[PDB]
Amino acid sequence: GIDPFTMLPRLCCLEKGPNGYGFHLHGEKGKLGQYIRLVEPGSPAEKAGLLAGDRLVEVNGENVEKETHQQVVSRIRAALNAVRLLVVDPETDEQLQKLGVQVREELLRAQEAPGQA
Numbered sequence: 001g002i003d004p005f006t007m008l009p010r011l012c013c014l015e016k017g018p019n020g021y022g023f024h025l026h027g028e029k030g031k032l033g034q035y036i037r038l039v040e041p042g043s044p045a046e047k048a049g050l051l052a053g054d055r056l057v058e059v060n061g062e063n064v065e066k067e068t069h070q071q072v073v074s075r076i077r078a079a080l081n082a083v084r085l086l087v088v089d090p091e092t093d094e095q096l097q098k099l100g101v102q103v104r105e106e107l108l109r110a111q112e113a114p115g116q117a
Contacts, residue, residue, distance in 0.1 A: 014048035058086035
């Protein structure tokens with residue numbers, strides 16, 4: 001039997017503290033997405049569940065799957081006191097996308113009957 005879903009994306013809501021959010025975001029050359037480069041131990045970023053390796057899929061509520069470092073930062077600026085980061089394990093993202101499911105948010109919703117229904 002095949003598992004339709006596995007280790008799905010997570011919208012991580014973290015708050016801006018004395019050191020910002022305590023995470024370093026970078027866009028890998030060759031690729032067209034943003035990834036968690038570093039999580040500063042003791043930051044609210046850890047509390048939200050950010051791990052160095054997760055792919056940034058969405059920011060606050062704006063899709064940044066294919067968006068550039070500058071484009072995401074601009075969306076990050078729209079965070080008043082706290083930012084919502086939608087992230088998923090990079091290997092899983094590609095396989096789940098092959099299933100045609102919108103990893104950005106619809107996946108988190110459609111945990112009830114896999115799909116838009």
